[PDB]
Amino acid sequence: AGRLREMRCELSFLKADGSACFSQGATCIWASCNCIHSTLSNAINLTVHGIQDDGSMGAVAINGACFALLDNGMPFETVFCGVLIVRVKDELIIDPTAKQEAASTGRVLFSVDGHPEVCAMDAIGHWDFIQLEAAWSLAQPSASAIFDFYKTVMKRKLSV
């Protein structure tokens, strides 16, 4: 099976409360609070930019939304990943790149009780259900990995 895109993220240095820069996976974008059902998860309660794209449509444009507010008085109970997995040809590659257009179908990005499992998702392509299940597993595990980074990025900012 494929794997996670390499992850990294610088934090704010601006003068809003929600702030950061999700510079990860060759697709470094910054957010704060073109180069929502996904964005909302758990209230209470209840604004992002992409500097460059060569990979994850949502994974980056979604994770970047969490950091900012996680580092913003808002608790960590409401965390979300949320990985995207593009099913290509046979088997499954994890995360995208320029190897994304050949996604065929492809394009299942679960916007993933904040311990393991799913909260939401989306599928796009002329494909059966036998496949989506292969994404019920392996996907959220990689998802677990990023929640750990989460903690770790937010393991340096609280104590610097």
Tell me: does residue 70 bind a second copy (CB under 8 A): no
Which has the closest alpha carbon to 56: 112, 120, 103, 118?
103
Output Rg (C-alpha) for the chain, integer angstroms: 15
Q: Which residue is associated with the tokens 């979604």? A: 62
Site for a second copy in 82-121 (CB under 8 A): 117-121
Q: Determine which residue in the list 6, 77, 90, 128 makes contact with a second copy, applying CB under 8 A.
A: 128
Q: Determine which residue in the list 17, 47, 148, 157 makes contact with a second copy, applying CB under 8 A.
A: 47
- Check: CB of residue 37 under 8 Å from CB of residue 80: no
* Binding-residue pattern over the window 19 to 38 for a second copy, x denoting contact by CB under 8 A: -----------------xxx
Handedness of CA 99, 119, 152, 44 (dihedral sign): positive
Tell me: does residue 125 bind a second copy (CB under 8 A): yes
Residues in touch with a second copy (CB under 8 A): 36-39, 47-48, 61, 65, 117-129, 132-133, 136
